Amino acid sequence: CGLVASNLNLKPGECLRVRGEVAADAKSFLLNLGKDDNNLCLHFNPRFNAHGDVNTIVCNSKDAGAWGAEQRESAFPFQPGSVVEVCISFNQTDLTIKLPDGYEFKFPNRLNLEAINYLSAGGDFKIKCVAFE
């Protein structure tokens, strides 16, 4: 729906900075990181209003097409109709997600993927920049 990027070969130790514009009417947006569309080490989905969630961040994994156990975050530094930046650090055991306000939290790497080769965006978000750091 939004950007799909493959042929990446991000490895442990490297950082992704993603800046985007959140829609005025945003309901939800997501960032998928993984091997391919069925093997996601990280599905990051801030829900403004969707699936029954309100101002909640839902994080999950996807293994061979099937979703894992959700993990919710109540930290919610996102405003509809804004331009935000999120940074994801890929470590061996887990991922660190750094929010626009500085807040950080971790998510485990349940796949035990050694690299990130796929990135996708969806929902109510317009990718503006992707950086490798």
Ligand X SMILES: CC(=O)N[C@@H]1[C@@H](O)[C@H](O[C@@H]2O[C@H](CO)[C@H](O)[C@H](O)[C@H]2O)[C@@H](CO)O[C@@H]1O
Distance separating alpha carbons of residues 22 and 77, to the nearest angstrom: 12
Residue 26, phi then psi, degrees to nearest 5: -45, 135
Q: Compute how many residues bind its own copies; rule: CB under 8 A.
A: 17
Binding positions for ligand X, rule: CB under 6 A? 43, 45, 51, 58, 60, 67, 70
Strands 125-132 and 15-22, sheet pairing: antiparallel
The answer to whether 86 and 100 are in contact (CB under 8 A) is yes
**24 assigned to a ligand binding site:** no
Task: Pick the closer one to its own copies by CB: 6 or 55.
Answer: 6
- Considering only residues 63-122, where is the footprint of its own copies by CB under 8 A? 120
For the annotated binding site, the residues are 43-47, 51, 60, 67-70
Give me the residues that bind its own copies (CB under 8 A), please.
1-8, 120, 126-133
